[PDB]
Amino acid sequence: GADAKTVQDTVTQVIEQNMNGIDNLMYMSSNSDSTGTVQITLTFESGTDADIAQVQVQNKLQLAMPLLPQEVQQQGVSVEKSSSSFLMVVGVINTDGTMT
């Protein structure tokens, strides 16, 4: 239920600031939506160990975690390591018409 400023100025900023001394980081690239969403996308050199790269990111996330609002920590921040484009999409429909 947040605005794009209230998510940027209360989550995104306090999460980009606590990011540092994280290796091979080429550039960080956050969007912030009047949908109530943040999304910061740290991009590492080629060859970089994806798995080490994944941790270092979060080492510095918890530095920041008890500084985000209560209501955001509840919802659960999430830190993945993943390509952008999908692999497959699996549909699920109901044939017998019973379920919306």
Please say which residue, 51 or 96, places its beta carbon nearer to a second copy.
Answer: 51
Show contacts with a second copy in window 22-41 (CB under 8 A).
Answer: 22-36
Please say which residue, 27 or 95, places its beta carbon nearer to a second copy.
Answer: 27
Show contacts with a second copy in window 45-84 (CB under 8 A).
Answer: 49, 51-52, 54-56, 58-59, 61-67, 71, 73-84
Q: What is each CA distance from 100 to 6, 12, 25, in whole angstroms?
A: 35, 36, 45
Residues binding a second copy: number (CB under 8 A): 63
Alpha-carbon distance of 12 to 69, in angstroms, equals 11
Short-list 35, 32, 41, CA closest to 10 = 32
